[PDB]
Amino acid sequence: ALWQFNGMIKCKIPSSEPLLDFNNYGCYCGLGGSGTPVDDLDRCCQTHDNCYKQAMKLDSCKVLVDNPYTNNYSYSCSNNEITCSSENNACEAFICNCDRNAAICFSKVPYNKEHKNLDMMNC
Ligand SMILES: [Ca+2]
Ligand SMILES: [Ca+2]
């Protein structure tokens, strides 16, 4: 679920405010997205967007009770490291990994403030 994804980002980037810093950035970070990514962070979000699209088409996930935004899974944060629990079912496990990869990607790229709130004519 989104609140668990927020927890993962914090696990990796303690000094961030997830829902604020990674929203309305580039052509892909935030609800929706399309066009040419403007930088590396924008590319992480393009990848995460595609992962969620795949999860919504997974057979093990029930239509739209098991969606990525509200499906809770089991995970743990150990020394700024993220672990998806083996007690999770198939659908829960795929979503946990989408979030895990994004949290890591975010922690490995630069944040360019000049790319906040760009108009669509630039994508
Ligand atoms: Ca997006
Ligand atoms: Ca669940």
UniProtKB/Swiss-Prot annotation:
Activated by trypsin cleavage in the duodenum. Can also be activated by thrombin or autocatalytically. GO terms for cellular component: cell surface; extracellular space. Binds 1 Ca(2+) ion per subunit. It is an enzyme of class 3 (hydrolase). One of its GO terms (biological process) is lipid catabolic process. GO terms for molecular function: bile acid binding; calcium ion binding; calcium-dependent phospholipase A2 activity; phospholipid binding; signaling receptor binding. The active site is at H48, D99. Its cofactor is Ca(2+). Monomer or homodimer. Belongs to the phospholipase A2 family. Secretory calcium-dependent phospholipase A2 that primarily targets dietary phospholipids in the intestinal tract. Hydrolyzes the ester bond of the fatty acyl group attached at sn-2 position of phospholipids (phospholipase A2 activity) with preference for phosphatidylethanolamines and phosphatidylglycerols over phosphatidylcholines. May play a role in the biosynthesis of N-acyl ethanolamines that regulate energy metabolism and inflammation in the intestinal tract. This is Phospholipase A2. The lineage of its organism: Eukaryota, Metazoa, Chordata, Craniata, Vertebrata. The chain holds residues 23 to 145 of 145 of the full protein.
